[PDB]
Amino acid sequence: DKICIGYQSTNSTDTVNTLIENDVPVTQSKELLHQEHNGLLCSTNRGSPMELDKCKIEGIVFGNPECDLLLGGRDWSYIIERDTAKEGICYPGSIENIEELRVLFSSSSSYKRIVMFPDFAWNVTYTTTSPACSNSFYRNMRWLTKKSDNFPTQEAQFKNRESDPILFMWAIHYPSSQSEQEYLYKNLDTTSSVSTEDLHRNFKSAFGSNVAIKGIQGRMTYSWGILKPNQTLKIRTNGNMIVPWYGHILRGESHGRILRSDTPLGNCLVECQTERGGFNASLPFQNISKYAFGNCPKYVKTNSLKLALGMRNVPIKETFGAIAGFIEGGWPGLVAGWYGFQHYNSEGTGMAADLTSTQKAIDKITSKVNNIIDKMNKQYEIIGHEFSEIETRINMINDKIDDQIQDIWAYNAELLVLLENQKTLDEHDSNVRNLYERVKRSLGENAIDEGNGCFELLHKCDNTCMDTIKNGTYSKYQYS
Amino acid sequence: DKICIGYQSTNSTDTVNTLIENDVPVTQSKELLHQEHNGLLCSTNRGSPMELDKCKIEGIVFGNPECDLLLGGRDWSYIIERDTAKEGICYPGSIENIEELRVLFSSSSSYKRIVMFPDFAWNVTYTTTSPACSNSFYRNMRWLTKKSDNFPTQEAQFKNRESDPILFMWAIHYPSSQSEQEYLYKNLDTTSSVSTEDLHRNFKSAFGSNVAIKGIQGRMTYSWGILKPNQTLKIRTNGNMIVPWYGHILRGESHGRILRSDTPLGNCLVECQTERGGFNASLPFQNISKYAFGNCPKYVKTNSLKLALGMRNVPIKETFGAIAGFIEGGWPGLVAGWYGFQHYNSEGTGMAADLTSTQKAIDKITSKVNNIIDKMNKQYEIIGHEFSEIETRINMINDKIDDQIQDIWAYNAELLVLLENQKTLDEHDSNVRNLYERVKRSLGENAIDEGNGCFELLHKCDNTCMDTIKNGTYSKYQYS
Amino acid sequence: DKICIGYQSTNSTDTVNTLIENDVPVTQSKELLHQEHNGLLCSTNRGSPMELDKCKIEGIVFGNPECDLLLGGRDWSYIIERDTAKEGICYPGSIENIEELRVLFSSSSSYKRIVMFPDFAWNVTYTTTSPACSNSFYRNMRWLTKKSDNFPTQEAQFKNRESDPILFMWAIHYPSSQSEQEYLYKNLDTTSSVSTEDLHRNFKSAFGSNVAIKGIQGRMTYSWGILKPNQTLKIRTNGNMIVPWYGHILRGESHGRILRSDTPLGNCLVECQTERGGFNASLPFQNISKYAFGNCPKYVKTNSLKLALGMRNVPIKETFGAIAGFIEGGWPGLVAGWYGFQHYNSEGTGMAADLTSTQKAIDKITSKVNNIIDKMNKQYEIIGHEFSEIETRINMINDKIDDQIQDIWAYNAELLVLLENQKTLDEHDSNVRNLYERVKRSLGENAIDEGNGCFELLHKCDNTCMDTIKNGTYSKYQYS
């Protein structure tokens, strides 16, 4: 009569790699690399996007007449700019610090548009429009020009009596010629000034031809500022100035999440949003995109990070089948557990799982997986940024951060999986060996350690004796 | 007669976590996370701080009259700005590149103030003061205004004949009105120029009202520069210029350490200084602050990084107490060592530590701890930086570096402690098993391996024979 | 008769460190830290350098007359500036955004110089030269001055009809005095304008003295721009402007690789190029330089990263020599393999390697080394950057990235080598123990496990029986 200690072999096709071996068959494995997304742009935990289908961010900021105003309590956590959004500034010119302005507007926790300089309080003409601007003009500024061939110096003030800062906008106009300068502002040499308690800026007139844009040869330089609570904004000009009209109240701003994308919008909530799609993921790594916002696994460019869970899955080589245990390989027949017993006595042969050692092993492998997954922080995000033509150095520095961080995570995740897989396979060997040593102690000198998982019993052992050996109540000292 | 191999069990309450198990009792452990600070702002190895109680950095730079001059050989390695330090620039205006200027002044290895343009060599009035500036004016510049209703062009030069570069300061004044412009400089349109071999800057006059600051409606724009050794600075103006007077000699500058803090100053030396307090630490990690200067462990936000040193601390379950060794658990009675022997013979029972295997194990655990601690570099620091309103992109990029580095260290330190704890417990099991196998070999066929740490001796073994077994001189071949 | 299981001991002097032990002798080891370079500046996989022996980058950009023009199909992947390259701009002044300009020119995949404003199409004088510029003038711009005591407004246009963007250059001149202003441009107050569809820039005249540079007291401010395909550049001026003449066609630009170095140029191809020399390397780490371009191992400042390959190299202590195996140490005589047998019978004694277990062990150690080496990514580079005097914050941030990344790699590489060395030595112990257990099973009860690698055979075993034991065909059940 014999009793043998073995472990499960299964129909699984899974293989993994380890630090020391390639393509080892295993009975169970777990992917650590999240690989799927829902092909949509969704809400995150921080909020919902603002989709812009015909207007650029700065079109909304300055109030391009082809753009809708924003709803008076809207919030958004990121901005989507479709390839059809082409309405930015409409009158030919340039925006100062456009990248910083777009970042500033890229998020809001509760939007409000506030009037700052009522258009009827100006003493000159304030109604001018332009064909470049849909035969209208901007909705957040007013173009001042001469009235009755005169342009006395205008001066007006506004105090921020709100609880949050206000983003405000203005521009300086440079006509295409001296006659255009006279026609619009009468005075040939003008001075415009913007000031607060924190800043003072002076602008002097100029005119002359420029490269024609849709027929127009004058130019505007667009500027912007932030008026903090209780500060006062003074506007002064005797020509060439497009003055503020309405400001935007800034609440929860400058998160920077801007996405130029054609991916369809959806009605969905997601932990992690990328340009090509969003997803929920408990895994610590992902191969979907280097840029993502929300609560995001670290990005790793590779196809798989497969962790071994179960054991080496090579059965004992069938060639009648002799009798052996764990030393020769696994048992294709073992069912209810990872490790178990096969016995041979005069009532026949049988095979039963050992639930204790199996559950101990499962708890250990489960806490290993949970530690590898749970220790990963998911607070910070890596997002795409915009840089101007004279910002290639900071562009390179930004990319260097993203790339060096990626190299660290790729190497550490690959090596961690390889090292842990080696350990896990060795741990299963240790577990089944420890089951075998327990029985050895329990059987004492009543059995010869063939040792190949198998024990030759020096006395007959029927099914009841076999059960006592399995459930650990067999006494090696018994007399019957 | 029996001899048994076991290991220590103690009254310790320590637990640790391992990759595969939670809250394992251990007999000894070591914190890797430094958690204490002295609640004070101290000196570091680089030097001592400069505490500023009423003046801002730029107040000292331009020489606000409410500020003391600096001592002529002072050094400092960082700057402390208390919440009462409100004297920066006193005449209403703006400093160009203020963040860069404050960084430049944030450290000095040996300070000196040097005169560059003696105030009496100007041919116009150079004495003007202002109520905004304590009815005085700046101590490092001079306000030039008309003399006898006249302002001929002034022009003067200064060569840096020192061995180090000089920081110098100037400003341009924009009066509140045309009449103020005439009253101060006579000429309505003025030109001011600053030049060196490396730079040339031109400034034209302007005037007009601004938002009133403490009643004043004119404004100044403050500027600064660095004159390198042997270079020459030429100053030219016919109005609107506040000219340099004294410069600061720059030695060991631009370290960037600036602290806005109410933490009390102390008379202490420290390796690592944070806003809330400093500390000495041999440990590689710390949870005190993300920003610190000096020689600093890496920052990890968590409560504990507990490394196991001793062994699993579960004693053999008392239930008379039978006889077993290391296979069943630890011995609460073992005292002078980690591993040892318990013997049973006709003269009685006894328990003695094995010093050899204990010292080998101690050396291994000690070198593991020292490698984990000593390989950590402590040269570089992560410090808080100041950014302007149009610098949110580089602000975000800077924060991304700090945050991604933190995520790497947190994950690697947590996992390293978990992996090493697993290994250390297994290593203690291996050590005591190896002691047991040595005795087994030495006893040879004179003993039955009960194997549970215990050996049943096939011959009587008195205290002297027991001692020979312990100190390895027992011969399994002996005839007596 | 006896048969013993042992492992190789050799004449090797190699030691390594492990997490738990110092200066362990080993029979074979491998450096992971690349330490050699060829003392030359070479080509990389991206291309060959441009060596500049007398001209600075910006000398080539603006066309300093002492510089050769570039060949019309030249490419370069980085720039070398020798300490003799002193010809940058020749007429005294300053370049706007000089760091960004030098980065932009630092690489090209196929160069071309293109004429944009033929010098003979100007209606004023366009030929002026200066002693500061070798009694010539720049080759890529033209100095416009008055003709017949007159300077009517010039205006000209150029469209980019190429497939790539064009870098173009211009400057504004500020004479040393009003009489110089009249002599050069007649008009006392001039206006110059540069414009494209994307930009408009206006420049007004000024004059006055400056610090004299090689006798000259006027100054130039140099500017530059990028005209994209199909855009139009309009140039307008009535004085003080140095106008574009030739532009540079930008193909594969802004890689940033600039090297100020005296290292000799060579005719060599290299994976990784540093300032002091280049090298090919399969290893994942290098200690040659923190800055390098190409495909580069991570930089680690330390002398050695020695990985153990073979086994603990302590032979059994010779003291006649008794009989033992792997438990006591290694065999200085074992030759053809790592693990083997020593036998003792009536025909004599012998020693033979076991090729199976040796090859299995070699495959495992080899895949460990290859995984540690091959998982390292070598796409990204860390290079030195240039920063201006008001860019110390981004300078510090850049250095922080480089330094924090270095701290991570140094700690992880040191600890990885220590941990793997511990494991590798333990793995060799396991391998030889597993060989010993195989023979034990094969010999069954025909041998007493002395266990010290040695088996005492309970029957005579001649050379043929010994060979059957070695090649695994010995039957413990045999009857002869």
One DSSP character per residue, A389-414 reads: TT-HHHHHHHHHHHHHHHHHHHHHHH
Q: Look up residue C129 and give its two tokens.
A: 């030269």
In one-letter notation, the amino acid at residue A175 is: P
Alpha helices (runs of H) in A155-210, residue ranges in sequence order: 178-185
CA dist A292 and A285 (Å) reads 12
Minimal C-alpha gap between A206 and chain C (Å): 8
Nearest to C462 by CA among C346, C353, C354: C346
Would you call B439 helix, strand, or coil by DSSP? helix
Question: Which residues pair with residue C136 across a beta bridge?
Answer: C130
Alpha helices (runs of H) in A123-265, residue ranges in sequence order: 178-185
Q: What are phi and psi of C16, to 5 degrees?
A: -135, 165
Say if CB C77 and CB C256 are below 8 A apart: no
Spacing of C-alpha A339 from chain mean position: 41
Q: Which residues make Cβ contacts (< 8 Å) with residue A125, sequence separation at least 6?
A: A144, A145, A146, A147
Residue of B nearest to A405 (CA): B404
Question: Which residues pair with residue A221 across a beta bridge?
Answer: A94, A172
For residue C124, the number of C-alpha atoms closer than 13 Å in the C-beta half-sphere is 26
- Quote the Cα angle for C457-C460-C462, to 5°: 110
Alpha helices (runs of H) in B163-263, residue ranges in sequence order: 178-185
- Quote the Cα angle for C253-C259-C261, to 5°: 155
Domain boundaries, chain B: 2-36+282-470, 48-260
Closest CB from C199, C382, C412 relative to A94: C199
Task: Count Cβ atoms below 10 Å from residue C335 Cβ, excluding itself.
Answer: 12
In terms of residues, how long is chain B?
480
Where residue C354 falls (left for φ over 0; alpha for ψ -120 to 50; beta otherwise) is: beta
Say if CB C265 and CB C41 are below 8 A apart: yes
Q: Which residues make Cβ contacts (< 8 Å) with residue A321, sequence separation at least 6?
A: none
Q: Is the Cα torsion angle B183, B223, B392, A204 positive or negative in sign?
A: positive
**Kind plus residue range of the DSSP H or E element containing B405:** helix B392-443
Say if CB B105 and CB B257 are below 8 A apart: no
Q: Which residues make Cβ contacts (< 8 Å) with residue A322, sequence separation at least 6?
A: none
**Answer CATH for A48-260 from 1.10.540.10, 3.30.559.30, 3.90.209.20, 3.10.20.30:** 3.90.209.20
Q: Does C458 touch chain B (CB under 8 A)?
A: no
Q: Dihedral angle at the C-alpha atoms of C371, C373, C377, C380, nearest 10 degrees?
A: 170
The radius of gyration computed from the CA coordinates of chain A, to the nearest angstrom, equals 37
DSSP secondary structure code for residue C332 in this structure: T
Q: Which residues make Cβ contacts (< 8 Å) with residue A91, sequence separation at least 6?
A: A130, A132, A133, A216, A220
Place of tokens 């060996």: A433
HEC letters along B17-57 = CCCCCCCEEECCEEECEECCCCCCEEEECCECEEEECCECH
Question: Which residues pair with residue B388 across a beta bridge?
Answer: none
Closest CB from C20, C94, C208 relative to B367: C20
Place of tokens 């289908």: A53
A contact residues 380-399, partner C, Cβ 8 Å cutoff:
389-394, 396-397
Q: What are phi and psi of B102, to 5 degrees?
A: -65, -40
Say if CB C176 and CB C218 are below 8 A apart: yes
Kindly list the distances between the CA atom of residue C83 and the CA atoms of C51, C53, C263, in Å, as whole numbers in the listed order.
Answer: 11, 8, 11
Say if CB C105 and CB C253 are below 8 A apart: yes
- Residue numbers in B near A387 (CB within 8 A): 393
CA dist B310 and B325 (Å) reads 17
Nearest to C196 by CA among C172, C225, C170, C154: C225
Strand boundaries in B116-184, DSSP class E: 141-143, 154-159, 166-174
Give first-to-last CA distance, chain C, whole Å. 18
Q: Look up residue B210 and give its two tokens.
A: 């601004």
CA dist C255 and C78 (Å) reads 8
Kindly list the distances between the CA atom of residue B161 and the CA atoms of B158, B196, B226, in Å, as whole numbers in the listed order.
Answer: 9, 14, 14
Q: Look up residue C270 and give its two tokens.
A: 């290299």
DSSP secondary structure code for residue A168 in this structure: E
Buried b or exposed e, range B175-186, using 16+ CB within 10 angstroms: bbeeebbbebbb
- Residue numbers in A near C376 (CB within 8 A): 407, 411
Q: Look up residue A362 and give its two tokens.
A: 């499962």
CA dist A117 and A246 (Å) reads 7
- Residue numbers in B near C94 (CB within 8 A): 198-200
Q: Does B22 touch chain A (CB under 8 A)?
A: yes
Alpha helices (runs of H) in C375-462, residue ranges in sequence order: 392-443
Return the partners of chain C (3 or more C-beta pairs < 8 Å): A, B
Nearest to B415 by CA among A371, A415, C415: A371
CA dist A54 and A52 (Å) reads 6
CA dist A192 and C2 (Å) reads 106
Nearest to A145 by CA among A178, A183, A89: A183
Say if CB C338 and CB C8 are below 8 A apart: yes
Q: What are phi and psi of B214, to 5 degrees?
A: 40, 45
Pairing mode of beta strands C33-34, A272-274: unpaired
Would you call A119 helix, strand, or coil by DSSP? helix
Burial environment of residue B163 by CB neighbours within 10 A (0 to 12, 13 to 18, 19 or more)? exposed
Q: State whether CATH 1.10.10.10 applies to domain C47-260.
A: no
CA dist C255 and A195 (Å) reads 41
Task: Count Cβ atoms below 10 Å from residue C228 Cβ, excluding itself.
Answer: 15
Burial environment of residue B266 by CB neighbours within 10 A (0 to 12, 13 to 18, 19 or more)? middle
DSSP secondary structure code for residue C220 in this structure: E
DSSP-assigned letters across all residues of C354-384:
-HHHHHHHHHHHHHHHHHHHHTS--S--B--
Q: What are phi and psi of C10, to 5 degrees?
A: -135, 175
CA dist A246 and B145 (Å) reads 41
CA dist C437 and C444 (Å) reads 10
In one-letter notation, the amino acid at residue C259 is: L
- Residue numbers in C near B204 (CB within 8 A): 206
Resolution of this model in Å is: 2.4
How big, in percent rounded to 5, are the helix, strand and coil portions of chain B? 25, 30, 45
Give which of A209, A221, A402, A404 to mutate to test C binding, by max C Cβ within 10 Å: A404
Q: Look up residue C43 and give its two tokens.
A: 């080509």
In terms of residues, how long is chain C?
480
Q: Is the Cα torsion angle B83, B84, B85, B90 positive or negative in sign?
A: positive
Q: Does B210 touch chain A (CB under 8 A)?
A: yes
Say if CB A308 and CB A296 are below 8 A apart: no
In one-letter notation, the amino acid at residue C90 is: C
Return the partners of chain A (3 or more C-beta pairs < 8 Å): B, C
Q: Look up residue B84 and give its two tokens.
A: 């009462």
**Kind plus residue range of the DSSP H or E element containing A101:** helix A98-105
Q: Look up residue C23 and give its two tokens.
A: 């200066």
C contact residues 121-150, partner A, Cβ 8 Å cutoff:
none
- Quote the Cα angle for A248-A251-A252, to 5°: 135
Q: State whether CATH 3.30.70.20 applies to domain A2-36+282-470.
A: no
For residue B376, the number of C-alpha atoms closer than 13 Å in the C-beta half-sphere is 21
CA dist B15 and A331 (Å) reads 38
- Residue numbers in C near A414 (CB within 8 A): 371, 375
Say if CB B116 and CB B245 are below 8 A apart: yes
Question: Which residues pair with residue C174 across a beta bridge?
Answer: C219
Alpha helices (runs of H) in B277-391, residue ranges in sequence order: 355-374
Closest CB from C20, C407, C411 relative to B368: C20
Closest CB from C389, C397, C407 relative to B380: C407
Q: Which residues make Cβ contacts (< 8 Å) with residue A127, sequence separation at least 6?
A: A119, A142, A143
**Kind plus residue range of the DSSP H or E element containing C144:** none
Task: Count Cβ atoms below 10 Å from residue B47 Cβ, excluding itself.
Answer: 17
Say if CB C242 and CB C171 are below 8 A apart: yes
Where residue B448 falls (left for φ over 0; alpha for ψ -120 to 50; beta otherwise) is: beta
DSSP secondary structure code for residue A108 in this structure: B
Nearest to C239 by CA among C148, C130, C170, C145: C145
Experimental method: X-ray
Say if CB B187 and CB B218 are below 8 A apart: no
Say if CB B396 and CB A401 are below 8 A apart: no
Q: What are phi and psi of C351, to 5 degrees?
A: -140, 125
Give first-to-last CA distance, chain B, whole Å. 18
The radius of gyration computed from the CA coordinates of chain C, to the nearest angstrom, equals 37
- Backbone breaks in chain C (C–N > 2.5 Å) follow which residues? 319
Q: What are phi and psi of A250, to 5 degrees?
A: -95, 110
In one-letter notation, the amino acid at residue A272 is: C
Cβ of C200 and A93 within 8 Å? yes
Say if CB B255 and CB B342 are below 8 A apart: no
CA dist C466 and C472 (Å) reads 10
